[PDB]
Ligand binder design. Structure first.
Ligand SMILES: *[C@@H]1O[C@H](CO)[C@@H](O)[C@H](O)[C@H]1NC(C)=O
Ligand SMILES: *[C@@H]1O[C@H](CO)[C@@H](O)[C@H](O)[C@H]1NC(C)=O
Ligand SMILES: *[C@@H]1O[C@H](CO)[C@@H](O)[C@H](O)[C@H]1NC(C)=O
Ligand SMILES: *[C@@H]1O[C@H](CO)[C@@H](O)[C@H](O)[C@H]1NC(C)=O
Ligand SMILES: *[C@@H]1O[C@H](CO)[C@@H](O)[C@H](O)[C@H]1NC(C)=O
Ligand SMILES: *[C@@H]1O[C@H](CO)[C@@H](O)[C@H](O)[C@H]1NC(C)=O
Ligand SMILES: *[C@@H]1O[C@H](CO)[C@@H](O)[C@H](O)[C@H]1NC(C)=O
Ligand SMILES: *[C@@H]1O[C@H](CO)[C@@H](O)[C@H](O)[C@H]1NC(C)=O
Ligand SMILES: *[C@@H]1O[C@H](CO)[C@@H](O)[C@H](O)[C@H]1NC(C)=O
Ligand SMILES: *[C@@H]1O[C@H](CO)[C@@H](O)[C@H](O)[C@H]1NC(C)=O
Ligand SMILES: *[C@@H]1O[C@H](CO)[C@@H](O)[C@H](O)[C@H]1NC(C)=O
Ligand SMILES: *[C@@H]1O[C@H](CO)[C@@H](O)[C@H](O)[C@H]1NC(C)=O
Ligand SMILES: *[C@@H]1O[C@H](CO)[C@@H](O)[C@H](O)[C@H]1NC(C)=O
Lengths: 434, 182, 197
């Protein structure tokens, strides 16, 4: 019987608070398909291969074979538009500075490599090697020759992988050097440690935490990136979501092409046999039944193609909005840009998809405390301006809410409103005056 | 059948007559007189795709052939009457094929008529239809430094539109009279 | 500019016109006119030829409907997006970037279009940048002084604290900087005077 998880129990009481005293930088991963192969089919020689008379009779059905081509071209241009809207979200093509010292953080594993002939990052190269894709409209001169000989063709994407990698590197350089300012207007440079201090300040952690734990944060980020490369390398089933697209496309094409063998009740599956070895007056009817069966097969094929195109377009819209909110900004929507409190994200191209690297913040080491909602000093309730009123013992202090750092309770981080008889749970304590 | 009888390079067994592809189509036939392998390959084909500006602007066009080395589109001519596109005056070979009647330019502009694999044509200046390589955008290199920040000192309010369809048209069909008129 | 809606209209018209054109397809029968077929055949032969047309026209109808269902699903997805926008964009101010146009969001106004809606996203765009020299903190009496809200900036000689989105220099007092620790652990701290008001 399935186990739903480690059955846990948290110790609720009404004068106890658990505040983390440490943290942990965690680089997550998320893999999203963007586009699929752009196939195109021609009736006249798929159905009536080398049979003028079959073409003449197929002329009667007629208008059908413009619906098919129209739908297929719509799907193809939709894939091109999907790629455009996912990646081409930057005005200029930014360049990383010639010297790389971003305050101790190490982006070597995500920035492009000039050494390789293709200017792809180590992670992008690893992804491309990991996923095995079929011929992408390579010039004919395998299973591809079988399909290509029946009028079934795959068109090549308008965006070559190298210029997709150029978009990706432009986005990376923009978010590393400028910040989120390059997605809301012009690019405004800023030192990376100050940018990351702002990112902490946007999740309710003061920046004096980063400016004093910069070394720990840099080391954790570097190790997390290394572990991401190792994990998505060793495990082969990490990115089966992209392989599913290729499998389904090639599988549908194979089913369609070998469906040409069924006789649909006719005497033979090859037309010249019906024409030489059978009388024309009902040979017309028999080949008409064959044509109807084959038209039905094409129509079915394009119906699943259209449904799968709609699903891929929904996935591409999700990828585009993740590129906007996650990469170009810093979202507060929880679990949208990775498990934990969101910090940054880094896009990485992949065949027929994109993969993000969600950097998040996770608290690590908690500690019980005794808490109060307010403090009565001189018959006046005293609420915390920002933070909580914890107390290891008689030492009632005021910390921030996401990282234990106690402070003396004074009239600067405490605002007064009322008298200390309306609040249930107020605690007598002194509030120092500077 | 029908197709180019072609010199083969595979080998059968000492008794094999036919050769089949995946979708049970005759790929090779044992030669009747001589004990020789003979392969049946459908004589070469491909889509013909035409790049045009608006007829409101011009009437000369380029023609893109999908998946051909361009050394076979003169092989497969209408003779074997519009020749100027089969023969080579302006022939440019790309991953999608070769497009004839369009001039390749070593420059790079934005994209007008997508061809594929990064190439896409246009109609510019003495007037011809050019083909070039797409340009991503204006080059830029922000001046990163570890004690330098850029702060704006002025703003511009800007308003933009965003079109969005909401509802389509509500139709209704009469099966009995459409399928079976009166 | 607004060809997105014209595309919907054209798609509907074309889809609904291919049906009307489809009736001129003999579909393997002698002719695509019912009356002639019934008037030139014995009862038995007619049934055979007629079944051809009936089955053909039924198929055509399924082909048209299925595609109508797919297109209606796409339109429903688009309509759900429009509603979300109208709610979080027209009825509030959004913090999701590039959702309500490029730039920082201010307002939005809806306008009604034939079979659609159009929004006028009022955004905010910084215009004139200016290089400055910045520091993470300010060691004054041995204690680091971090900005309460904003960034430390120097015009070459003096140091100021300004907003992050609009150059608004201020004298560094202790009412806009908070102290945290001593000035030997943060990398990049600089000396300066922090005014006591
Ligand atoms: C916080 O955790 C790190 C390891 O991630 C450790 O090196 C450090 O000593 C911890 N600090 C405290 C105060 O527990
Ligand atoms: C950054 O990490 C890479 C590992 O990919 C390493 O080879 C390189 O030496 C690191 N950079 C520095 C400055 O140590
Ligand atoms: C607080 O004490 C309770 C009971 O011993 C314990 O279960 C809990 O783990 C403690 N606080 C923390 C660190 O969660
Ligand atoms: C609680 O922490 C405060 C501040 O560090 C300390 O003065 C006090 O001794 C601690 N609790 C005890 C043991 O009273
Ligand atoms: C916490 O709950 C217990 C159980 O009723 C109650 O007796 C106690 O007064 C509560 N504490 C406070 C501070 O209200
Ligand atoms: C707080 O002090 C006042 C007077 O000093 C006293 O009347 C009241 O009972 C005290 N309350 C607590 C919870 O100690
Ligand atoms: C046909 O005749 C030629 C003439 O010599 C001979 O070589 C060949 O074997 C004959 N074909 C068969 C099937 O015997
Ligand atoms: C065929 O195409 C290849 C590239 O795929 C090219 O190198 C070659 O020159 C072309 N022509 C011939 C005759 O191989
Ligand atoms: C900026 O980086 C350069 C070289 O990496 C270094 O010499 C300089 O001290 C740095 N400036 C700081 C840390 O303020
Ligand atoms: C800000 O820009 C506007 C142009 O939109 C200009 O009229 C105005 O004088 C500028 N103000 C300053 C202080 O530069
Ligand atoms: C900032 O400095 C860089 C390099 O010194 C320069 O390219 C850029 O134009 C400067 N910015 C402004 C607004 O002058
Ligand atoms: C910087 O601003 C101060 C304002 O107190 C001014 O006195 C000084 O001349 C300015 N220096 C430069 C280089 O602009
Ligand atoms: C700041 O002033 C102190 C004075 O004790 C000095 O020791 C330190 O070197 C100064 N820092 C810089 C960066 O000049």
């Amino acid at each position: 019987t399935m186990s739903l998880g480690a059955e846990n129990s948290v110790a609720y009481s009404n004068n106890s608070i658990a505040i983390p005293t440490n943290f942990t930088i965690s680089v997550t991963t998320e893999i999203l398909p963007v586009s699929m192969t752009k196939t195109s089919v021609d009736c006249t020689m798929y159905i009536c291969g080398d049979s003028t008379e079959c073409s003449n009779l197929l002329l009667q059905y007629g208008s059908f074979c413009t619906q098919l081509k129209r739908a297929l071209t719509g799907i193809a241009v939709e894939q091109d538009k999907n790629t455009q809207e996912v990646f081409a979200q930057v005005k200029q093509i930014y360049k990383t500075p010639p010297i790389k010292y971003f305050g101790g953080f190490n982006f070597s594993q995500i920035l492009p490599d000039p050494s390789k002939p293709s200017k792809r990052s180590p992670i992008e190269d690893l992804l491309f090697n990991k996923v095995t894709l079929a011929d992408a409209g390579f010039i004919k001169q395998d299973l591809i020759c079988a399909q290509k000989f029946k009028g079934l063709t795959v068109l090549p994407p308008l965006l070559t992988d190298e210029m997709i990698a150029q978009y990706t590197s432009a986005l990376l350089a923009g978010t590393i050097t400028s910040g989120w300012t390059f997605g809301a207007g012009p690019a405004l440079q800023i030192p990376f440690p100050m940018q990351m201090a702002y990112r902490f300040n946007g999740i309710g952690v003061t920046q004096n935490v980063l400016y004093e734990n910069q070394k720990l944060i840099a080391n954790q980020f570097n190790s997390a990136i290394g572990k991401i490369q190792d994990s998505l390398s060793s495990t082969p089933s990490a990115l089966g979501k992209l392989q599913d697209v290729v499998n389904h496309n090639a599988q549908a094409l194979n089913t369609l092409v070998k469906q040409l063998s069924s006789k649909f009740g006719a005497i033979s599956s090859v037309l010249n046999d019906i024409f030489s070895r059978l009388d024309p007056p009902e040979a017309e009817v028999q080949i008409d039944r064959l044509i109807t069966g084959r038209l039905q097969s094409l129509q079915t094929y394009v119906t699943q193609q259209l449904i799968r195109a709609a699903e891929i377009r929904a996935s591409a819209n999700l990828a585009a909005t993740k590129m906007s909110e996650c990469v170009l900004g810093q979202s507060k929507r929880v679990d949208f840009c990775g498990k934990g409190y969101h910090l940054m994200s880094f896009p990485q191209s992949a065949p027929h998809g994109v993969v993000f690297l969600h950097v998040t913040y996770v608290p690590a080491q908690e500690k019980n405390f005794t808490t109060a909602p307010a403090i009565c000093h001189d018959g006046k309730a005293h609420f915390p301006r920002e933070g909580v009123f914890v107390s290891n013992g008689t030492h009632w202090f005021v910390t921030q809410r996401n990282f234990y750092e106690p402070q003396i309770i004074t009239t600067d981080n405490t605002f007064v409103s009322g008298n200390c008889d309306v609040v249930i749970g107020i605690v007598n304590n002194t509030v120092y005056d500077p | 059948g029908t197709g180019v009888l072609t010199e083969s390079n595979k080998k059968f067994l000492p008794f094999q007559q036919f050769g089949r592809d995946i979708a049970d189509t005759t790929d090779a036939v044992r030669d009747p007189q001589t004990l020789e392998i003979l392969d049946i390959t459908p004589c070469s084909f491909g889509g013909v795709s035409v790049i045009t500006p608006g007829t409101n602007t011009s009437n000369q066009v380029a023609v893109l052939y999908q998946g051909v080395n361009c050394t076979e589109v003169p092989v497969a001519i209408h003779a074997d009457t519009w020749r100027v596109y089969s023969t080579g005056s302006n022939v440019f070979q790309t991953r999608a094929g070769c497009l004839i009647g369009a001039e390749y330019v070593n420059n790079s502009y934005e994209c007008d008529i997508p061809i594929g694999a990064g190439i896409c044509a246009s109609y510019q200046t003495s007037q011809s239809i050019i083909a070039y390589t797409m340009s991503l955008g204006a080059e830029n290199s922000v001046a990163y430094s570890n004690n330098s920040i850029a702060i704006p000192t002025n703003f511009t309010i800007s308003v933009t539109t965003e079109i969005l369809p909401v509802s389509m048209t509500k139709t209704s069909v009469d099966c009995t009279m459409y399928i079976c008129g009166d």
